[PDB]
Nucleic acid binder design. Structure first.
Ligand SMILES: [Mg+2]
Ligand SMILES: [Mg+2]
Ligand SMILES: [Mg+2]
Ligand SMILES: [Mg+2]
Ligand SMILES: [Mg+2]
Ligand SMILES: [Mg+2]
Ligand SMILES: [Mg+2]
Ligand SMILES: [Mg+2]
Ligand SMILES: [Mg+2]
Ligand SMILES: [Mg+2]
Ligand SMILES: [Mg+2]
Ligand SMILES: [Mg+2]
Ligand SMILES: [Mg+2]
Ligand SMILES: [Zn+2]
Lengths: 175, 48, 76, 119, 70, 134
RNA sequence: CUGGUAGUUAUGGCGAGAAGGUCACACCCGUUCCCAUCCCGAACACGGUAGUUAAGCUUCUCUGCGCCAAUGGUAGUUGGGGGCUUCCCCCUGCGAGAGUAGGUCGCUGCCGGG
RNA sequence: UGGGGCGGUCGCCUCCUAAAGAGUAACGGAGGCGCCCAAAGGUUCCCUCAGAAUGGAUGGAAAUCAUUCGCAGAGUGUAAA
RNA sequence: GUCAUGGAGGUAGAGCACUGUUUGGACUAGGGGACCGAAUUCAGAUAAACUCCGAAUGCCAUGUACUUA
């Protein structure tokens, strides 16, 4: 709860002073992290999906749920119910544990990060961060990892608008 | 594939019920627990 | 020189008993596909969606909410 | 931004789903149950006339002594059963109320059952 | 947390070679150490690389290529 | 020549032309119209001929609106074929016009040229008409 | 005043704005136990009340959307009679759809607390 | 059988013709069937679609995520009602 | 047979709330170094196999009403 302590000790009343919230619980709070690998390329490959499964299991610590295919389109050689992508949902203490391990340890080894657009949000109070490889996370080493898939890391915030979500992310760490 | 089958009681030996199955998805002889009129209780029936 | 020319025999749907007519238990009140009329009181829906009385009484076609109807039987 | 779901709304949806099969007639009234964070309630209801017949609650004058929040359920169940039996009610149908028949609701039902009420 | 399906998990200690900031965190890798920092949570120490207080943009091998020239 | 691009059904009933027009009996877009006084069928060729004869007179001045369209279709049998053996192959497209319908429009030209153009168009149609003003 | 629970074709809904409370009801805190997630105490289940009316909830105002809705007229039409029969006209009875005057931010029943 | 022959058809299901109960013909206008399912049946518990916009994107018009809008614009083994 | 009362049923008519057919105007996703053009809106039409609506007649019943076989 070190990151819980950092959030609760000083972030909460700083936000309250900055935005003059009427009560104490208009404060935006981190609520959900969802991970989608996007392994749809594996139309016939079976080891690719499984390999993504243990990759996500090791990176998070929770068993990833394989996701089926909503529709069937022949443009991308897929049918109904094909196992496409992964699905991991952290929640509770895993919010701050994963956020710590990312922003303090895993993130800094990226090649040429110089910030991301404050407009690179959804415009309604969330954020999706992308990673182009699986070696940015220290838990997975080079020998075990064969390929890299650019997955999607989403940030869910209870903010009613975008500016306070952006500044909250800055106050906790990297925008 | 689709065929007619008959179910026989494993105690009396009377072919009480008839039904159908898919021969490819069910190559083995199916078994069900139906009601046997002669004994007036429930027994186990097998495809012949 | 014609690809058409075929049809199916009619099924005689509709209402078989009138509103306010005394009815005997177990008699058909309405033959119909789907549910154009819902079963009300002392009446049930058959396997093929017919409506039949369950007790002796008088037939009454009431109205449920705005866009659907029902039929009920009231004893004497 | 996420809109938190409303627990009571979906609870009432499930209650309406349950009520499609359960009807409180005069001879066999309906036993409705409502559960909150603090306490639990119970009501015996008929539907052909739309009037209640017996009731009990944790916050009633009786059942002052309390324990963990399953013993309050047992106590309110036995009190409502006794009150209904004193009024000649013997056969009832248990209206679950959109909850699950697992915890407080189950204990209340068993407490009502062990008294003079054929649920 | 359904039993059996989940893999192992336990907090550890993260240390950098530049800041030496032992910052307690959870992970799946033991890192095979034992440090007495943060008494009561003496989790194994995990060696790491450039961290938040190691990167220029954040706050503020190639050695061989200097052996020949120098 | 106006022809629908698609039709759900190829063959159609012929219909009837009883009563006044359902709607469109008042001139809306332009200032001059050609209103039918009796009921008739209008093929697409007659519409084409009337429109050409009416646009040529104005010398590509002003604007013209066609207020009717040939939705329906009709069939026919060749010479020498007995009755029966199905319906015939479709031939053309018609617009059933009831009385009171305004079915042509003129705007952007003075009284004289508009009236003369409408008069020239009215001689190509098989229905008695009259010229009305907004 | 408020909590629970039913009836009635939204005149009851959608939308917009304000006020309120720890008496009730919620948000909220926690996962040792009962119980649970194709993963996740989010939900469900259980154990509690430091903080809150921000939302849920209740009350108050409106006609912006939606909804209900005449009178008069008209189309149509049973019966009878006429024509110049792609169709049209007259007498009697019935009588819409659209448009509009107007109405609406609900009305009733039972039980428990104040 | 709008003479007979050649061509087409012959049993069952759905719609229009069919004129607001039911029924109603033509070598009239459109389609399907001669199966399938051991769960695609029974029961108990739970929940809700198509599509559109915004961002990450290996990955584009379209795969897998997250939010918002969304009375059915989906689905219902198969033809239509 | 008529009168009074209650019903089921979507035709005539009408309408665009769904599905097809369709006219003029505005703007435009998208491609184009200006031009076609998806979707939105304004106004105006059309339908045996369209329906947010919907008659007159006919039909099925009830009556103790009045005639009639
Ligand atoms: Mg039929
Ligand atoms: Mg059935
Ligand atoms: Mg059957
Ligand atoms: Mg008080
Ligand atoms: Mg435990
Ligand atoms: Mg309404
Ligand atoms: Mg009137
Ligand atoms: Mg009216
Ligand atoms: Mg008829
Ligand atoms: Mg009929
Ligand atoms: Mg026939
Ligand atoms: Mg055929
Ligand atoms: Mg018509
Ligand atoms: Zn036997």
């Amino acid at each position: 709860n070190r990151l819980k302590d950092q959030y609760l000790k000083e972030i909460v009343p700083a936000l309250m002073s900055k935005f003059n919230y009427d009560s104490v619980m208009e404060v935006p709070k981190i609520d959900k992290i969802v991970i989608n690998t996007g392994v749809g390329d594996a139309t016939a490959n079976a080891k690719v999906l499984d390999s993504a499964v243990e990759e996500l299991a090791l990176i998070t610590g929770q068993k990833p749920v394989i996701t089926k295919a909503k529709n069937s389109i022949a443009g991308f050689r897929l049918r109904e119910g094909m196992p496409i992508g992964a699905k991991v949902t952290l929640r509770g203490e895993r919010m701050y544990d994963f956020l710590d391990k990312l922003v303090t340890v895993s993130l800094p080894r990226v090649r040429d990060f110089r910030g991301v657009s404050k407009k690179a949000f959804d415009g309604r109070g969330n954020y999706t961060l992308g990673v182009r490889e699986q070696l940015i996370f220290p838990e997975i080493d080079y020998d075990q990892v064969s390929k890299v898939r650019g997955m999607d890391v989403v940030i869910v915030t209870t903010a009613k608008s975008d500016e306070e979500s952006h500044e909250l992310l800055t106050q906790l760490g990297m925008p | 594939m689709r065929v007619n089958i008959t179910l026989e009681c494993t105690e009396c030996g009377d072919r009480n019920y008839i039904t159908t199955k898919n021969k490819r998805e069910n190559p083995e002889r199916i078994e069900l627990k139906k009601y046997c009129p002669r004994l007036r209780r429930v027994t186990l029936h097998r495809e012949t | 020189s014609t690809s058409n020319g075929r049809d199916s025999e009619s099924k005689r749907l509709g209402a078989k008993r009138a509103d306010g007519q005394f009815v005997t238990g177990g008699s058909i009140l309405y033959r119909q596909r789907g549910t154009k009329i819902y079963p009300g009181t002392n009446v049930g829906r058959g396997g093929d969606d017919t409506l039949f009385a369950k007790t002796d009484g008088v037939v009454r076609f009431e109205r449920m909410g705005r866009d659907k109807k029902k039929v009920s039987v009231y004893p004497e | 931004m996420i809109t938190k779901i409303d627990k009571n709304k979906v609870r009432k949806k499930r209650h309406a789903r349950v009520r499609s099969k359960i009807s409180g007639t005069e001879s066999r009234p309906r036993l409705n149950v409502f559960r909150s964070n603090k306490n639990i309630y119970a009501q015996v209801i008929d539907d052909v006339n739309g009037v209640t017949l017996a009731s009990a609650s944790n916050l009633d004058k009786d059942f002052g002594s309390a324990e963990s929040k399953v013993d309050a359920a047992s106590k309110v169940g036995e009190l409502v059963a006794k009150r209904a039996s004193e009024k000649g009610i013997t056969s009832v149908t248990f209206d679950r109320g959109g909850y699950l028949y697992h915890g407080r609701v189950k204990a209340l039902a068993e407490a009502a059952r062990e008294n003079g009420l054929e649920f | 947390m359904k039993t059996g399906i989940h893999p192992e998990y336990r907090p550890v200690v993260f240390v950098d070679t530049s800041t030496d900031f032992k910052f307690l965190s959870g992970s799946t890798k033991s890192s095979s150490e034992t440090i007495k920092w943060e008494d009561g949570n003496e989790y194994p120490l995990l060696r790491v690389e450039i961290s938040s207080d190691s990167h220029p943009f954040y706050t503020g091998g190639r050695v061989d290529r200097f052996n020949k020239k120098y | 020549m106006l022809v629908p691009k698609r039709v759900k059904y190829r063959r159609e009933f012929r219909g009837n032309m009883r009563g006044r027009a359902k709607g469109g009996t008042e001139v809306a877009f332009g200032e001059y119209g050609l209103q039918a006084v009796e009921a008739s069928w209008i093929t697409n060729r007659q519409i084409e001929a009337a429109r050409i004869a009416m646009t040529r007179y104005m010398k590509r001045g002003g604007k013209v609106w066609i207020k009717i369209f040939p939705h329906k279709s009709y069939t026919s049998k060749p010479i020498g074929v007995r009755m029966g053996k199905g319906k015939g192959a479709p031939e053309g497209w018609v617009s059933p016009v009831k009385r009171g319908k305004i079915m042509f429009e003129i705007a952007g030209v003075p009284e004289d040229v508009a009236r003369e153009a409408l008069r020239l168009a009215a001689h190509k149609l098989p229905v008695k008409t009259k010229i009305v003003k907004r």
